[PDB]
Design a protein around this ligand. Structure first.
Ligand SMILES: Cc1c(CN2CCOCC2)c(=O)oc2cc(O[C@H](C)c3ccccc3)ccc12
Lengths: 215, 215
């Protein structure tokens, strides 16, 4: 009944080499093969190492696996670190009455460059207006770090009701996305000259404006 | 290179029984051992079943594995559901050397009433089209549990390229919201009769469609 012990967390800056260790609590590390998994936030894990040091196809050659018999440990070494490498890493081996996992190591890559959001404002769709709804959506994408402030306007005036903004989540380009949506009635949408979505990120503000359409 | 097919999600109240299936696309389920892994939210994976029906020590007998040769499927049955059972469950097997994982099933132990999502599909805005962008947005709101699967189509064919979907987040009404966006060029948009957003929640699938128009 052995366990595998990994650090809860490690951090390193881009271009440098980071090592993540996995210690076996009883028996010899070389009695069974060690695998490593990478898991990105709210997303599907992949195998980066199998049979201690073998990379599946598609895994960058920057990932290397090793065993140290004297410490009864295994290591994942990532050289020339990239931003995309930020993830949780798990080691795994085998124990007669079990497949055994380490507790996971969260790898933080430091110094990621700031990125301003792409902002797109959508007026109400035909289909939702037919169903007596006039929800607007403001898509905010490609931003880093993962925090924004959103305000809406009805004509020039602040909107005080009906706004929701999703918690930003990290997408496949390693930058954040969120949507803000304003749940108008058709009467509210048609009774104003326009609505606006104002997005602030790192002290810069982007504002988009849409108006009732000519069909 | 057979596939293992699991349902996207399952849910029940505390004290109930739930079954998760795992269907092998080709070959005999019999030919190779099936493992089940549990990953609780924000936790490391643990093995709950190995060799089709063996429980590791510390795994309670409320967990049961089985094989059905006739349906070429494996099942995990959890009786006396507890709130700690909420997790992603993955089945796993082998064809010769190659390790194969199922897609995973989210199990929710219901903490509030079920709620079907509001799904709204927005066509491209005039302003993003002048920037050579025809991004579509699929807004998904007011849902519980928080698990959804999104798929896109160009006419009748599946898309994978250009799709991003946000991690669902709880909003001010204590229900989930998320958005999926498809990053088209105006040339891609105008060159199809339509595009579709398909949202699956709790074994209900809904589909919204938009078409390049001038009304
Ligand atoms: C999807 C997936 C993969 C990727 N392929 C999917 C098709 O079969 C071959 C492998 C994987 O390598 O490893 C996985 C591993 C999984 O579960 C293990 C227990 C795990 C590892 C780390 C975190 C969470 C779960 C679940 C899914 C996968």
């Amino acid at each position: 009944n052995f366990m595998l012990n990994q650090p809860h967390s490690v951090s390193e800056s881009p271009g440098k080499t980071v090592t993540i260790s996995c210690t076996r609590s009883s028996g010899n590390i070389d009695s069974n093969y060690v695998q490593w998994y990478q898991q990105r936030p709210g997303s599907a894990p992949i195998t980066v190492i199998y049979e201690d040091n073998q990379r599946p196809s598609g895994v960058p050659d920057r990932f290397a696996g090793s065993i140290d018999r004297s410490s009864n440990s295994a290591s994942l070494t990532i050289s020339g670190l990239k931003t995309e490498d930020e993830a949780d890493y798990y080691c795994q081996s085998y124990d007669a009455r079990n497949v055994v996992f380490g507790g996971g190591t969260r790898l933080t890559v430091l110094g990621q460059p700031k990125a301003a959001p792409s902002v797109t404002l959508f007026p109400p769709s035909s289909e939702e207006l037919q169903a007596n709804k006039a929800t607007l959506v403001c898509l905010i994408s490609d931003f880093y770090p993962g925090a924004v402030t959103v305000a809406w306007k009805a004509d020039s005036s602040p909107v005080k009701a009906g706004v929701e903004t999703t918690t930003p989540s990290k997408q496949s380009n390693n930058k954040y996305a969120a949507s803000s949506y304003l749940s108008l009635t058709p009467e509210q949408w048609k009774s104003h000259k326009s609505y606006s979505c104002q997005v602030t990120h790192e002290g810069s503000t982007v504002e988009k404006t849409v108006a009732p359409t000519e069909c």
